[model samples]
Target: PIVQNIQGQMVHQAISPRTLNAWVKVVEEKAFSPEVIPMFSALSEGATPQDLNTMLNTVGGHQAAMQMLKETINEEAAEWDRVHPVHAGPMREPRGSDIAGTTSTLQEQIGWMTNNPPIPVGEIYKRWIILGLNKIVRMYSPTSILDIRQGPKEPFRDYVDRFYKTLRAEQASQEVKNWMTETLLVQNANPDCKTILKALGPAATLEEMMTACQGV
Candidate 1:
């Protein structure tokens, strides 16, 4: 009973469809949350972890608690409602509306367009939306990794090298080549994500991207 009860709440709350639907999303890893909290020092330019956590907790904890409650209640609703469709609601199913309005206004705002909740708002210069969209659109045709692994498929590394080699030999007009040359290797020395995607078509492999981007 407790196992079902606990999982009933957790599965409904934990599975994030928005994060899953994209090639990459900012995931809040519980295992790495401690490490992640400290990394914020670099962003805040030396804010102490204790104080930062305290401040953010004051702002965040209540919302997180309340939303978990909201989702739990919603999940206890109809069978057709659960993203886990095999079940029924009230008994065992769940869904939650992201990018929404509250009872106060009664409007469904995909507020991310303005606030960009899931993405860092202050990151204006990065144009990472272009990077994410490029990945998303490419994956509009989903491929099963399990199938690809067992099935005969092109070695992705070969595909990557071929593209790089192509880019290397061919002159990219004049200006494009200039941009590419300017970015070659330096600290924060990274290809503009948009440029990288347009040129390489979705850095689809996480392991490869990390190695190439040097742990971006």
Candidate 2:
């Protein structure tokens, strides 16, 4: 999907999981290409969209593409564990080569270290993957619309566009979204625009506020 900016520049639009999920189902039923199925599935499973898109565009085969995806997941999980050691539990101690690398041996060591029971590596990986995904998701989650602001010389039109992008990215109720939209438009306006808006009082809707700003 693409959208034309205020300056008439065409730009690729951001895709939400909801939009991607619809496309995945259609592609699955249509049987367009088997290769894309796993890619789409990985996206739906919370893999980074940009990472998957880059791999698909540059990588050769599905086998290698998935291998890269697995590597990415593992690296992200490791980083997450490093940052969140308490939730991830204690790190496994390095053992000598003589110690067997079997499940039973690992489980026995875990039993000695902590009271918590040991889970299979596969299950641990799944949990780590989910935790990493949530971390990424929260990175873009806006706590308040006030966090967004127009630059010193940024045009009102461009600022509004950016504000709405962050607004849509949030996961708030419609009523809350509307309130934030209005508050942001009024509070974050430039000095001249703010004076005009202050004199006229608040607009009834976001569109009206945007229209009011354009006149400034």
Candidate 3:
């Protein structure tokens, strides 16, 4: 590892040794001291000499190198989590038999799922069905419109705007969409608006219903 004064900043550049012995000597003796052993142990087996060089480059000294190493490990862990998010599984209360087993069946199953290449969608769906998670999964369908509740502190104009946007995004036939819009809009309105909406009765079209509601 070579630290060069580049534009007033101490930059680290790794020097590749021609011989294997030279490479090992630089990594084992020169790159790190006994003080850094605890931090260096956190690095993955796949970590290269350049990784250590980069850490020194980032901190400029050994005093905070351990902190930099921790940050680097945390960053790598975060990136891995972002790429492969863990899905929630069904929760089951542990029985007396569960505590009796020394082997970790759950960990083994999770490891198998993580290590294996992508499983087909049909297989995944079948597994969910077997686990009785089909309904929970199906409930997340984007086509379904969820109920809209107006916040107590929300303005009438803002509530109307939010309701309009939500209603327009639903995947349904024009007749069904209009019916849903009219029904949900009236049902979710504030108490003051509800009285006005009820007195006006149903409108002929979605546009008319929106206009009538906004007029309140």
Candidate 4:
């Protein structure tokens, strides 16, 4: 059936109210603002009014999406969270090729439920993926320069880069980074360690201490 509730837009034939509603609500109000485009487009596609309405009336869709994520997390954790290490690689990141083993399943489930297509999952469901992956990543993520140094055949320069890389992924604070640096320097007994701390000299504040390791 043809539908045209909004005055300025062109007549939309065969567009179901469920699809139309998502667009209008997203455009006019703050309903699902983050995934507005994908949500709207998904609704516009061959989405069933029943399916779209599920998204509307009860947040029906995301609930299933969330569950799929939870299941995937549990499954991943079953193998990675304990008995089995993800891999034998020196780098402790998701180096296991299978680390992303369930990512495709995640995308498939998220796409069907969120009405968003494959590849990068929708913003609506992205946080679930991040939240789930964070647990697994943290399980194996390097927590110290010592851990960072274990990457097989990796050069010192590459190890430092990976150290900061791992910390940044976890959104570690500058203070944490500073401490990690100090820990490494102290552990290695670097001659310039004192000089480096002194160079940060006279700032005399937490914020000042923050930049102390900035260039180091």
TM-score of each: 0.16, 0.35, 0.31, 0.26
Question: C-alpha displacement of 213 in model 3, angstroms?
Answer: 7.6
lDDT of model 2 at position 92: 49
Q: Give the number of the best model, judged by lDDT.
A: 2
lDDT of 1 by residue, 68-95 (tens): 4335333332221353345445511112
Worst 10 residues of 4 by lDDT: 91-100
Ordered list by lDDT, greatest first: 2, 4, 3, 1
Question: How many Å off is the CA of 131 in candidate 3?
Answer: 17
Which candidate comes out best when scored by TM-score? Answer: 2
* Cα lDDT tens digits for candidate 2, 1-216: 234579865344455656556644544463223344444445434222332343233333435334544555666555644664543345343121101122224333333223245323323343433443344334334564667667666667888888787788666678888778657676887787676567775445555555766745
Name the regions of candidate 2 deviating beyond 4 angstroms: 1-140, 204-216
Task: For candidate 3, list the clashing residue pairs, or say none.
Answer: none
lDDT score for residue 130 of model 4: 45
Residue pairs with backbone atoms closer than 3 Å in model 2 (clashes): none
Quality of model 2 by C-alpha lDDT: 0.49
User: Candidates 2 and 4: which is better by lDDT?
Assistant: 2
lDDT over C-alpha atoms for residue 118 of model 3: 23
